[PDB]
Design a protein around this ligand. Structure first.
Ligand SMILES: *C(=O)N1C[C@H](NOS(=O)(=O)O)CC[C@H]1C(N)=O
Length: 245
């Protein structure tokens, strides 16, 4: 593990705290800003959709990535969500109600079995449809990094087609120079807003795994935009987006 202290630049620019972890498979380099935070636990918020999708597909609650759960007719603050959505659409717009219904169909005893089998964070369920957003379940950035690396390499205890389907829906940006796959998250913990982006970037078929975790006590900061700007600035600094990795 190399300590990359210059990455503080991109967090200080937004007056936030955070860590960044970057594992470049092909060059065998592993860089981390804020090692202490990388070992601290936080609620996963919407990054848990990776796990929920895996278990939903594996148990067969979700038939395939086109599987539709209708809108329940409850109008929510995000217009994207007030529709009948396929798994792929719900994942990409981060539609919480889709995955709350997945969790209820999985059921708490089955969910607990899969948390325990994968050894996912503190493995703690409060309520079946809130536990990844209400600060009961917690996971560290280093744990999220290990999890997505195992997902990429088919090392989790799921069927290969289950894991291929989740990798496919995680693909968010594709150019000839790079393919960027990730899941974002945002949650609340005490006075703090916690932001996540977990995923990988592939250039020439070579993956680099990353986890970004940020926090602020400034209630007026736009975490949704700031987390993405910070990720793009960090990966640009590290030499990505040009097809050279
Ligand atoms: C997940 O963290 N959430 C669902 C939704 N989209 O989040 S994302 O942009 O982080 O993927 C809004 C934020 C958050 C929530 N409020 O539950």
């Amino acid at each position: 593990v190399e300590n990359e202290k210059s990455w503080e630049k991109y967090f200080a620019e937004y007056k936030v705290e955070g860590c960044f972890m970057l594992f470049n498979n092909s060059q065998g380099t592993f860089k981390v800003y804020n090692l202490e935070r990388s070992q601290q636990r936080f609620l996963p918020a919407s990054t848990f959709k990776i796990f929920n999708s895996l278990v939903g597909l594996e148990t067969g609650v979700i038939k395939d990535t086109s599987f539709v759960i209708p809108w329940d007719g409850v109008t929510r603050d995000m217009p994207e969500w007030n529709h009948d959505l396929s798994m792929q659409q719900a994942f990409r717009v981060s539609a919480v109600p889709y995955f709350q219904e997945v969790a209820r169909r999985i059921t708490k005893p089955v969910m607990q079995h899969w948390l325990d089998t994968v050894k996912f964070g503190n493995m703690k369920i409060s309520k079946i449809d809130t536990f990844w957003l209400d600060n009961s379940l917690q996971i560290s950035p280093d744990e999220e990094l290990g999890f997505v690396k195992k997902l990429y390499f088919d090392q989790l205890p799921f069927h290969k087609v289950t894991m291929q389907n989740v990798r496919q829906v995680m693909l968010m940006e594709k150019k000839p120079e790079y393919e960027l796959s990730y899941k974002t998250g945002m949650g609340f913990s005490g006075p703090k807003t916690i932001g996540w982006i977990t995923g990988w970037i592939e250039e020439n078929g070579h993956p680099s795994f990353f986890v970004l975790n940020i926090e602020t006590e400034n209630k007026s900061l736009d975490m949704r935009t700031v987390r993405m700007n910070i990720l793009r600035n960090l990966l640009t600094d590290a030499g990505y987006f040009k097809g050279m990795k």
